[PDB]
Amino acid sequence: MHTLYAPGGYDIMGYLIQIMNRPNPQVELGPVDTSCALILCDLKQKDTPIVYASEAFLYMTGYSNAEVLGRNCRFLQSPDGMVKPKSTRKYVDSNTINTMRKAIDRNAEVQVEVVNFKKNGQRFVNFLTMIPVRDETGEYRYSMGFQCE
Template structure:
């Protein structure tokens, strides 16, 4: 069986990377060599494979919280639990759309910055927010899953009620070394 490649450029208005173009023009099902420069994190320029994050959430052995239907359209962040102050190491495009912060603006920060207006004005926390923060701290310290409703602020200063789900994940380790935060705006405040 000879290998056939359709050399015609695929008809699409969507901009594709070279690997995707090769995949669309591939015909006979025979596996060929991997394209030069191909890496498993093809779907994100950050080097973090967003699809693998979602698979780790789906495949966790004893789910404690119901995430509902999640996919790459879900606002999410990934925090490094092994580093001091658990900084954000990945933020998705939908997170940027929800909060107004470009992913590069949040990398290296602890996600608590979302609890403060960008103006830096001190705000009085509600009893519900205080309870949510206590639950978040307990969950992160003990590698537990949690879901809370907490007031967060966008880059433009507007506040929203965030239905936050936190799930610790093991990534190339037997320890929980990352935490995934899934956000869902449930009310404008």
């Protein structure tokens, strides 16, 4: 993967406001900001790569900025951060992860509890919410994830 990052960074704050102000609310998650664990992935690049990770996310997972950026977030699904696309996971609910894949595919809001692993191998239940985000074009370009231990 050779994910390319937006020169000048991402409008994370504008996105947080966009989400809190959405008229549709399938999933209600209340007020949110940059102090929590969040990540932004690019739906328009190969394998939906992470293009931004908040400091809380890095801390929570134990990974560094350079170890997460450019990767699909599924790596958290294994204690060694090793997971092949479409492979059958040995510690995660197959139904759960397919719910995520299909939600993302349809730009549909979704919330799940999924087993993940910190860089040091520590297991945890990740209370995950994923919401599609429109860029200045007006259509869905990214997805913002909110992770909760």
